[PDB]
């Protein structure tokens, strides 16, 4: 994430705006864009003004059925296509995403409310997801040999697991959808994507791009719609054995329960209440920058947000105070403005839920230091009452509080004190979640020690969340299961096969002799 990002021309922005309201965002099924059979659609708001940006086809079980059949029918040929050819398609898709980057940026900025200074990197990462997994396509069947002396040869290989139903969140539509779509396609599987209803546009755009890449029909399908309708239908469909989910923990339970009906394989990346542990001996200037960014970037709407700030008592007053002042100075404004740091939340219904947590925090004794209410003015004087803007918020509280135990998914931070390493660790792990954790300290042994004991899928020492694609990404506890990233994704998208064969006449027990 660069310190400065270029703006998109006024004309391009205006062109994207009219194209969104000019034509409904349709499903992509069996190689073509189509509306729901009912003809029904649903609207998607522009979080900066709460005005309708456009509408998308309202898919149900009928559209999902057609999509699942299409994916199933195309699985035979796609899984048998040469890896080198699948690689070519993915690299092409990566190329085209870069070519349409400005469009995608505007689209997600207006639809999801993320700032351009974040969205540009997201679009770049979306293309990268394809370029990255394109190099794994040719290694997708590889595993091991287990020879036994000169008597037997056992060898293992991997084969595409089958159609994948990808259910994605609304915070980073393109980024988190391509993150699952790329490996799925690379590994020989077909796909049915069901985008979050609160930000469906970039998905239809992605479909246009995959069509421009001339991906075979049925290989990639898209079905816009509500989770309770198109979503639930996808989870229940007999022809889609694999499901990836990125959302709330409770949604994971619902999806898993319904998935049992067909013993489906699930790869869920759920919520989190990732802690940031700041020790007195750390580089406090870097720690301040990291913590402020890790909770307020993405408008605080990201699973790896450091929503709990554990600070060593001896520096609690000074450090937390510096965090408050920084949050106070955060530039709140329109997403398209390249200067904006924090934009509006996704939907008024989400802003309501977040305000609900703020209020609950007050009622339970948490000490509100800054924010905690709707933003009225931007950093440029603009009136922001029409959008879903929340001021960056900082509370001082106790780890057992509701606002410290439940995911808020908003720019709300809770600062909690700890007397020593043992207590910092205890409090850090005392959560139902376990996605990420951040530790700021200069002591070598303390750092690695905490990294080993912190119950999280990812631990970042002395920095914010900086990712390296080949590493296993995922959570423990209530944050999900399974891992994405390089070869680790292989374990979910493919099946292992052990093939055995004797090198000479083996001993075969005699029965009925």
């Amino acid at each position: 994430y660069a310190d400065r990002v270029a703006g998109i021309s006024w004309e391009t922005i205006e062109e994207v705006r009219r194209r969104l309201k000019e034509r409904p965002a349709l499903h992509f099924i069996a190689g073509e864009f189509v509306p729901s059979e009912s003809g029904e659609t649903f609207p998607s708001l522009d979080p900066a003004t709460n005005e309708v940006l456009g509408v998308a086809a309202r898919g149900g079980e009928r559209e999902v059925d057609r999509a699942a059949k299409a994916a199933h029918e195309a699985f035979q040929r796609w899984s048998r296509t040469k890896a080198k050819e699948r690689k070519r398609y993915l690299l092409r898709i990566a190329e085209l995403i870069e070519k349409h980057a400005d469009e995608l940026a505007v689209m997600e900025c207006l639809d999801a409310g993320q700032v351009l200074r974040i969205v540009r990197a997201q679009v770049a990462r979306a293309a990268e997801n394809f370029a990255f997994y394109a190099e794994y396509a040719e290694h997708a069947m590889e595993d091991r040999t287990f020879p036994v002396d000169r008597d037997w040869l056992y060898y293992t290989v991997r084969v595409p697991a089958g159609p994948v139903g990808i259910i994605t969140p609304w915070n980073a539509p393109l980024m988190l959808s391509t993150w699952r779509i790329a490996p799925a396609l690379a590994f020989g599987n077909t796909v049915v994507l069901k985008p979050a209803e609160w930000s469906p546009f970039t998905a239809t755009k992605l479909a246009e791009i995959l069509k421009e890449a001339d991906l075979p029909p049925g290989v990639f399908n898209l079905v816009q719609g509500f989770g309770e309708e198109a979503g639930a239908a996808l989870v229940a469909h007999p022809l889609v054995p694999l499901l990836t989910l990125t959302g709330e923990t409770e949604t994971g339970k619902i999806v898993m329960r319904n998935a049992a009906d067909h013993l489906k394989r699930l790869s869920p990346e759920l919520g989190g209440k990732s802690p940031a542990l700041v020790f007195a001996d750390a580089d406090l200037e870097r720690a301040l920058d990291a913590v402020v960014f890790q909770i307020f970037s993405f408008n605080g709407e990201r699973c790896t947000a450091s929503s709990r700030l554990l600070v060593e008592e001896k520096i609690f007053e000074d450090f937390v105070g510096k965090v408050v002042e920084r949050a106070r100075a955060i530039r709140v404004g329109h997403p398209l403005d390249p200067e904006t740091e924090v934009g509006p939340l996704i939907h008024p219904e989400h802003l309501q839920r977040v305000l609900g947590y703020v209020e609950a925090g007050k009622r339970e004794g948490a000490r509100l230091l800054v924010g905690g209410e709707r933003a009225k003015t931007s950093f440029r004087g603009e009136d922001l009452s029409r959008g879903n803007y929340l001021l960056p918020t900082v509370f001082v509280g106790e780890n057992h509080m509701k606002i410290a135990q439940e995911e808020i998914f908003g720019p709300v931070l809770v600062a909690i004190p700890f007397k020593d390493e043992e207590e910092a660790l205890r409090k850090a792990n005392d959560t139902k979640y376990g996605l990420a954790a951040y530790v700021f300290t200069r002591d070598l042994e303390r750092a690695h020690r905490l990294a080993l004991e912190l119950e999280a899928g990812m631990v970042y020492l002395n920095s914010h969340n900086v990712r390296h694609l080949p590493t296993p990404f995922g959570g423990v506890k209530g944050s999900g299961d399974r891992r994405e990233g390089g070869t680790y994704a292989l374990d979910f998208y493919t099946d292992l096969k052990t093939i055995a064969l004797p090198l000479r006449p083996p001993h075969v027990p005699k029965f009925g002799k």
Copy 2:
């Protein structure tokens, strides 16, 4: 041959026969949790917010 097993190999089924694998290192993917630990070797670039 008939079913002759070598314990280190991944054992399990596909479709209606189950999921996951048992056997040597493959058992590890089920009984254990992976963890990725990151750390910079020199002052990294951290985006500035509220400066």
Copy 3:
């Protein structure tokens, strides 16, 4: 002098028994399943470094004994490399079991022969047993590798196979531990062996052969030839039936061996010299750092390849820290190997003492400041006269990294302390030698630690601790310290050969020629 009824858990009676058998029984070669002398009948003596008296004699092997040993290993390779891994595993476990049963004898024998304190040698016997117990578990995985399927058209898979007989040439400081370090993997991976141990401490090897025979290894699988490096050693390196060679010794010996090995393009796995540095920063736990650097250079009588012979200390604490190193070295108890109070014993041979003292003199003449030691130990901690043994006082110099005592391996209890003003300079000086075996870094700063770990040219880096090994990790050095690696699966790359097997799943296109 009977210092106690038991030392390192060994009865004094056992100690005297072992000493007596060494003088009574010549150490013979073990060839084609039998103990035999050299055809010439010649033998060579081995001294007791504590008194320089003859402990006993060992057969002086030459080209003829080596030829017979190589033929035996070669002839037996055919059957041994095809034995079931489970069966080889059984043998290694039996060997480990028998080493443990003869532990007291082995400890005393090597102690008397090589001069290390008995308790340390006893712990080394345990490590030797562990070497076999460890690799016993890799035997059944020795053929394993990967599959590289190509869509539905081809299947490529790889396997590993025993590479061939291994000539194992070892040093005089730790006979049992260093020889079993190579023998165990060689055998586990299906190869036969011909061991040629250092001539200054031959006894333990003949004893080891006795044990392998007690384990009932097939004839020819393990062979032993005692003798001088230029005789038995060079003959083994030159023999056409021993394709693999492991060498643990001096860097210069590595050059001579490689040159000789070229005639048959032999595969070599050398673990050579070292001049490993210890870098102590002002922000580290100085109490632990002090314990570590003192131990890392003076333990094992300074005759340890991974010894931190160069101590780099940040300037702002140089005077105080180095001063503390000096007082600790001054307090080190020097005495007989069989005395439980001894911390530093005698060097291996008078010739080695003359060489080490030669370096001490080189240091004095080049401007190095001698702070302690620098000459023979006259009296033991108990007031005994030590003039008959090869005892050297723990020695500490303050010098510069360009000095000869800083650049060349002394292989004795001699340390050279060198200052550095900052991280950049600490790293530059650390890497400025022709060696690259180990390195030790003492600092509490997370980023500086990993940064230096990545930049230090060494096969092994230890952060905030002395040398503590974990067998599965790759062990070896860079630069003049050798090449290749030992340890778990890493050893496989040397002892086995990779093979890529390909087969089409359907009729492939064969270019048409002459059709």
Copy 4:
């Protein structure tokens, strides 16, 4: 003779142009980022294997040129090994891209210089581009290894670092493909390079240097020194600043190089000679087998290291099968490298043709039965006079595995057919060679195929097919065919150094010494 308007998709005009450029421009060295001649001004010529006339000349490099190249590689190593992997990947992809851009010129140049059929050289250029595009994807994984945590007390982890400047010494048969096979991985993994190409076909190498300069590699990262093996070659092997060495050539050269490399304990990755056998069983798809064995020995003018120079055929089908091989060989079209209908071109140099004829003669006096060929090809399939070129007729002998023609590498279109009574014998004869590069088995029986694949002493075994490669697999030989492996992650073991880093998670126990 203008054979056509276009050959291998290349216009005759382009062919003529490349040909005259060679006569006008001497092939210079590329040192420290600039093309330079030898300080002495000396040069040596390269012949056109089709007419034995001088195509052009190349600078005759010696010790002074190698010294300058080694220093440049050394000096550049510091920064190059520290460049970001993503940036090195960009460079390799740029090189790959530029190789394709200059593909026609490279194809013609090497065709003219080394004598292979133009379309085959053109295909080889595509493989050279692929070498860079392939390793480009490994650059970012070059430091990766493992973690070996020990409970909650220790963390041991391993990484890999660039090993150092690499001296690449290559053969004359396939200049571009074989040099890039080593250059690509060397650069991808952070090492600098000094290339010393075979003197019989130097042009392509200088062209490759022009291309790398076009890709704008930093000065000193890639250096080239033209010259003879005993001059520039030996100088490179002996230079102290080039720690790693790749050699692709004859086994005898490997011995000489290893001996010379001993002086600085250099790491060698040799791919040497071979006498790869093809085993044909009565139950195999004999039509595919026939196409496969004919191609595997006669393609590439028989100058391919993996050529199946020995044909082992089961007795009951020996007469029929070998008879068919003979007729196919008789039908092979011998002609000029630029003639689209040519199947077999001229050998590299008159000295080589004579060397091959020497073996043909030796085989006859030896008792081998010549079935076809066995002498110079004086007339092409079009009736042209080929007497001024180095053309050999595809040759087929029936002999015994112990014969010199069966034991020694001829490196030409010469085949030796040998019979076998059964699997046991086929395996015995197949392995009874001082070589062990490749092996080909033709049989439909599952268990026999895998059984033979496991027992055949070769680095690569192909079942029911000719030589079809998959880059990620380990490529190399055993016995006299070399050591080490190239290909994907296997090349890492040679181009990088492993490092084990250890750190305690809590205060460890350091043995108390001197207190």
